[PDB]
Design a protein around this ligand. Structure first.
Ligand SMILES: [Cl-]
Ligand SMILES: [Cl-]
Ligand SMILES: [Cl-]
Ligand SMILES: [Cl-]
Ligand code: NA
Ligand SMILES: [Pt+2]
Ligand SMILES: [Pt+2]
Length: 129
């Protein structure tokens, strides 16, 4: 599913991301925008052989099982395919563990390079929330 901007902002707010670990909703909407362009079915293979999945590009090295990432963990206890659903629950639930892990939203490289320190409020501006 390709979410609209305000559509994803509502879904992410419903699922408790607004100010989750201190990160305002705009940060999560931005991170989705640059990780996946809001497409739940986004996948990207990494040179190390892991794959990133879903709206927040969650990596199989740590967080999910795809059966093809040797040596990896599955800390969200889900098949990576669950991260591709039109329903964002598995992605958000897994992202809450990721952002709790020590480095906050720096775990999402696109967030650090493109969202951090910017006017992230713009991403939710105008949305009924
Ligand atoms: Cl947009
Ligand atoms: Cl915000
Ligand atoms: Cl694996
Ligand atoms: Cl933090
Ligand atoms: Na894995
Ligand atoms: Pt909804
Ligand atoms: Pt939820």
């Amino acid at each position: 599913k390709v979410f609209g901007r305000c559509e994803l902002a509502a879904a992410m707010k419903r699922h408790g991301l607004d100010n989750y670990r201190g990160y305002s909703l705009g940060n999560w909407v931005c991170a989705a925008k640059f990780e996946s362009n809001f497409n739940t079915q986004a996948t990207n293979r990494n040179t190390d052989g892991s794959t990133d999945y879903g709206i927040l590009q969650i990596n199989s090295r740590w967080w999910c099982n795809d059966g093809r990432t040797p040596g990896s963990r599955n800390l969200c206890n889900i098949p990576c395919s669950a991260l591709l659903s039109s329903d964002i629950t598995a992605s958000v639930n897994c992202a809450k563990k990721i952002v709790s892990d020590g480095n906050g939203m720096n775990a999402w490289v696109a967030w650090r390079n493109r969202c951090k320190g910017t006017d992230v409020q713009a991403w939710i501006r105008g949305c009924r929330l």
